[PDB]
Design a protein around this ligand. Sequence first.
Ligand SMILES: O=C(NC1CCCCC1)[C@H](C1CCCCC1)n1c(-c2ccc(-n3cccn3)nc2)nc2cc(F)c(F)cc21
Lengths: 230, 11
Amino acid sequence: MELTPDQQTLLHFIMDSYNKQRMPQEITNKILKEAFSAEENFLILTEMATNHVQVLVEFTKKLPGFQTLDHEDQIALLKGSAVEAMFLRSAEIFNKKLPSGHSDLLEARIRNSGISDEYITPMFSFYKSIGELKMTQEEYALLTAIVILSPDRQYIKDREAVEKLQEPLLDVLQKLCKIHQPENPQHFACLLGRLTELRTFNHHHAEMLMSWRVNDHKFTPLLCEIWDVQ
Amino acid sequence: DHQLLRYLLDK
Ligand SMILES: O=C(NC1CCCCC1)[C@H](C1CCCCC1)n1c(-c2ccc(-n3cccn3)nc2)nc2cc(F)c(F)cc21
């Protein structure tokens, strides 16, 4: 039931790499301070997402066994998980506790950022349902690692090799779920269930970006490689 | 041809 010394070592190593990401407070301070036009908000999103992918590649490289994978499979895992990891991180930031009234303002500011109405509802439906899990930082870190090391990703030549790397992370997450939420034995299944909803954002990511209420949709060369844009 | 991704991966 308890984590082994090897698992505790794995967990702290993954926590340390995960903590290298841009701080949630930095992001919410910017959105909460003042209101921006849809044009300014689009630019904030592309810079935020560019930094996210850069740090995600650094986090992915540190995942045990990742560097032993075939180079083409490495690209396929990164490309297959980038958008999902971005929405998982956004969901984590959204659910961080803030002073009274701040989360209501954050929600209203995101709702009026320039994103199409069609996508506001499924985005907030996902954020609120992630929030009901009351996940710890370790649970978000492991889930992000599990998302990256998905063997069921398209163009993966050697699935078994990816499975071998994901399995120890799934076992660590399962133990944490039993430790953090012993009254809810369904917790682990609920976290895994949320990965299916994550996959839906990846299906409509390009349309979500192109329907942003701006006249021009400019993307960084790194974003064009990761997103199906320009 | 994910040249930038390949680059950040092989760095
Ligand atoms: O910066 C954000 N997210 C980053 C991205 C990288 C990793 C960390 C977070 C944005 C932000 C850009 C400025 C206007 C207002 C929104 N954000 C989003 C968001 C909104 C739309 C999209 N779209 C993706 C395709 C189309 N839309 N992605 C994320 N959800 C957020 C939840 C927060 F608590 C929150 F604080 C910000 C959030």
